Design a protein around this ligand. Structure first.
Ligand SMILES: NC(=O)c1ccc[n+]([C@@H]2O[C@H](COP(=O)([O-])OP(=O)(O)OC[C@H]3O[C@@H](n4cnc5c(N)ncnc54)[C@H](O)[C@@H]3O)[C@@H](O)[C@H]2O)c1
Ligand SMILES: Nc1nc2c(ncn2[C@@H]2O[C@H](COP(=O)(O)OP(=O)(O)OP(=O)(O)O)[C@@H](O)[C@H]2O)c(=O)[nH]1
Ligand SMILES: Nc1nc2c(ncn2[C@@H]2O[C@H](COP(=O)(O)OP(=O)(O)OP(=O)(O)O)[C@@H](O)[C@H]2O)c(=O)[nH]1
Ligand SMILES: Nc1ncnc2c1ncn2[C@@H]1O[C@H](COP(=O)(O)OP(=O)(O)OP(=O)(O)O)[C@@H](O)[C@H]1O
Ligand SMILES: O=c1[nH]cnc2c1ncn2[C@@H]1O[C@H](COP(=O)(O)O)[C@@H](O)[C@H]1O
Ligand SMILES: O=c1[nH]cnc2c1ncn2[C@@H]1O[C@H](COP(=O)(O)O)[C@@H](O)[C@H]1O
Lengths: 471, 122, 79, 79
């Protein structure tokens, strides 16, 4: 027999003193498994499960299309900011969805009467070079041939009929075949493209070797049933947001998040009702709530998820411009302990500075964690370097900052995953779900961390130093 | 005394203070006495004050509307249709407070940034 | 039913620890009105009502005549 | 708005003082139904559901066959 040490989460948070992530610790447990064995499958909303809990916050200095792609590839999801023209946001979502496709059902095609200059122009315009050719220059016509980059390794006035690989030579698969068999015939073919034609010899769709190559390369990517990257987008709660949402759903958004400083309001509830009426198949994530009372009416409105946290952002001045808010640890704990009964996951956003904070937030009931500054300076972030809060400018709600640059997401997130895995392995949880069950049952115990125990991080015993995380 | 921000103004209005009196917040303005470069009234038998300096803040007629709008937005985010209703809410027990330890105080203009600017619309 | 969260003012100030403005927060509520609708009419004394709470302190580096005028014009009062 | 009164079960039993049935009460609520409408279907074990919670203890001065019959007839069960 050995006495129990430390405070359960319930005991720790009962005092009502306002704890944050930097104000407590998790005592260790028992290790009987390699770190890599830990499983991080997390639930974004009630119908989306992500293989990692990382989310990029919707802001104008983060989550471009080029970052939503590079973060969906690594298992997470990214929300496209809404501080832009509705057509711009729709274009961003289109470029996010058209990175890997499976069945490319809307390929751009041309007629034999076009010119090599036209093919080159389309290449420069979009990026795709394997232009299918049909008699009428559209999907509804006979497949006569295809022209690719290897056909144009050069004069630009010559017609496509002189450079096509004709249909007499093409290896094609009959339409109506399942995806697996299509890949089989593609891979025995040893050629890049495999157009798909029906029994009438009419072009229906195509597939690309590079898409399955990308699948091979990125094992943890997030995709829908059509094997195309999962995209999310944010929208306000004004009237123009209805047209914004129309455009977004035309683009093909999968999950939408409502953006507001305080979620609990009649306008947000009206937006939730409009969304769940016009687009029943779309998952809507509620606004920023820090309390059970705020969470209740959003849950009743029917938000498939919840964003928790207010006043604790790195770029946030709300706590000073107005008196409202709540410390992040208490907020996430006390809306994720209440939401759990209805199955709506939580996204604890703001205050995440380190892997320690990420794991602390996932231990307190937050299904996923949304990051801001941590991802603001990266090769995939918007803008350019030298050598901004989305409400930072009638009143300033934010601030314009600067960060040291941190490489690329595709080389930075694997370290962020390994850190979480090692942090859970040092505790003895085989997965995040088991960790949160441990927190709920009382097995996982916390210890408070006064200031003289906080100073025991990078203690000032040194004169100077460098960090070098493997990243 | 102690009023540094709109948050402090609204906090003082919530706790029962009918009005709030400002010092330094209005000391450097186009309407304040003196002249610029580029003082407590007991600051000089014994020094009760200090002689300071502040960054200049335009004019009252352009700065106070911002200070009103901040108060209005802060009460609107709480759900009080007026200051009297806010104080009645505080008295009846409907409006509830949360304590804010130091590690929760550092979560304002957090030091995650290298440098920055504020630019309040004022 | 949803449980109550936080401390009332009476509960917060009963501990007698010496709180200041930078030492507590107010938890949010319900929004069903535009911000501009809020009304700030406040009482200076038992026979003076100001349309805004703002006051300028009486000091020799603030509240000249030219500031008392410019602050009375904006709804407040200056000493 | 009306303040909450009383202790939840968790708050009542956290003190660890050893309460019994004669040591606490349940505060009332809201009535919007006739008494007879209440439904008492209770679960004896994981595959037996009784229409009333009542059980007779197994003892030599209670639960004969003639009482097990007369208590199973009334919705309960007898050991
Ligand atoms: N950390 C935080 O909690 C926090 C705090 C402040 C701001 N922010 C961010 O700042 C950005 C914008 O914040 P915001 O508060 O200005 O959002 P917002 O302007 O969209 O909503 C705030 C205001 O909009 C009004 N409003 C909303 N719908 C309305 C309607 N239909 N009719 C009339 N008025 C309506 C509300 O009454 C309120 O005054 C977002 O990115 C938000 O997340 C975040
Ligand atoms: N053309 C194409 N095929 C894909 C794509 N993604 C997956 N597939 C195919 O669909 C099947 C997916 O099953 P697996 O490869 O065993 O599993 P996986 O890689 O986890 O698949 P995902 O769950 O989509 O990541 C295989 O036949 C893949 O080749 C894609 O983007 N394009
Ligand atoms: N490496 C390589 N990739 C190619 C070539 N031609 C086309 N592709 C890729 O084929 C991929 C298939 O995915 P998609 O982007 O969805 O293809 P698409 O929808 O037909 O066309 P775009 O949106 O115009 O790129 C594209 O991303 C192209 O980059 C080529 O010559 N080389
Ligand atoms: N289904 C097909 N059957 C036969 N040949 C095809 C088929 N699809 C494309 N080709 C031809 O095969 C050759 C190379 O095709 P492939 O798709 O591998 O080129 P690519 O991938 O566009 O070029 P790159 O080498 O730059 O990646 C070209 O002549 C092209 O026209
Ligand atoms: O302009 C703003 N004012 C106040 N909060 C913001 C603003 N823009 C983004 N936020 C929030 O602040 C967060 C970023 O904080 P970070 O995680 O510390 O970088 C996210 O949770 C946001 O939704
Ligand atoms: O000379 C002084 N010594 C001490 N307190 C002063 C003096 N002059 C003004 N005060 C008070 O200090 C206040 C100004 O503080 P502020 O609001 O932070 O600028 C007002 O409440 C005053 O009445």
């Amino acid at each position: 027999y050995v006495p129990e040490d430390g405070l359960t989460a319930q005991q720790l948070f009962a005092s009502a003193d306002g704890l944050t992530y930097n104000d407590f610790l998790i005592l260790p447990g028992f290790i009987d498994f390699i770190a890599d064995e830990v499983d991080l499958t997390s639930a974004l909303t009630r119908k989306i499960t992500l293989k990692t809990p990382l989310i990029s916050s919707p802001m104008d200095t983060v989550t471009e299309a080029d970052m939503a792609i590079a973060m969906a590839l690594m298992g997470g999801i990214g929300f496209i900011h809404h501080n832009c023209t509705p057509e711009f946001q729709a274009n961003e979502v289109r470029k996010v969805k058209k990175f890997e496709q499976g069945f490319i059902t809307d390929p751009v095609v041309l007629s034999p009467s076009h010119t090599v200059g036209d093919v080159l122009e389309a290449k420069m315009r979009h990026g795709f070079s394997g232009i299918p050719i049909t008699e009428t220059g559209t999907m509804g016509s006979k497949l006569v041939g295809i022209v690719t980059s290897r056909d144009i390794d050069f004069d630009h006035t010559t017609l496509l009929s002189e450079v096509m690989t004709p249909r007499i030579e093409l290896v094609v698969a009959p339409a109506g075949v399942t995806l697996k068999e299509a890949n089989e015939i593609l891979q025995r073919s040893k050629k890049g493209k495999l157009p798909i034609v029906n029994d009438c010899d009419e072009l229906v769709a195509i597939i690309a070797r590079t898409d399955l190559k990308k699948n091979r390369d990125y094992p943890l990517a997030s995709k829908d049933s059509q094997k195309q990257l999962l995209c999310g987008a944010a929208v306000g709660t004004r009237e123009d947001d209805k047209y914004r949402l129309d455009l977004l759903t035309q683009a093909g958004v999968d999950v939408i998040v409502l953006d507001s400083s305080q979620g609990n309001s009649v306008y947000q509830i009206a937006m939730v009702h409009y969304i769940k009426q016009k687009y029943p198949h779309l998952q809507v994530i509620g606004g920023n709530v820090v309390t059970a009372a705020q969470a209740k009416n959003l849950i009743d409105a029917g938000v498939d998820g919840l964003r928790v946290g207010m006043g604790c952002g790195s770029i946030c001045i709300t706590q000073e411009v107005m008196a409202c808010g709540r410390p992040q640890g208490t907020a996430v704990y006390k809306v994720a302990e209440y939401a759990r009964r209805f199955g709506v996951p939580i996204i604890a956003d703001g205050g995440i500075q380190t892997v320690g904070h990420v794991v602390k937030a996932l231990a307190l009931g937050a299904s996923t964690v949304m990051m801001g500054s941590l991802l603001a300076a990266t090769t995939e972030a918007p803008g350019e370097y030298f050598f901004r809060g989305m409400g930072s400018l009638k009143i300033a709600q934010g601030v314009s900052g600067s960060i040291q640059d941190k490489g690329s997401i595709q080389k930075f997130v694997p370290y962020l995953i390994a850190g979480i895995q090692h942090g859970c392995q040092d505790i003895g949880a085989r997965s995040l779900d088991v960790l949160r069950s441990m927190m709920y049952s009382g097995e996982l115990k916390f210890e408070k961390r006064t200031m003289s125990a906080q100073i025991e991080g990078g203690v000032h015993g040194l004169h100077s130093y460098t960090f070098l995380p493997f990243t």
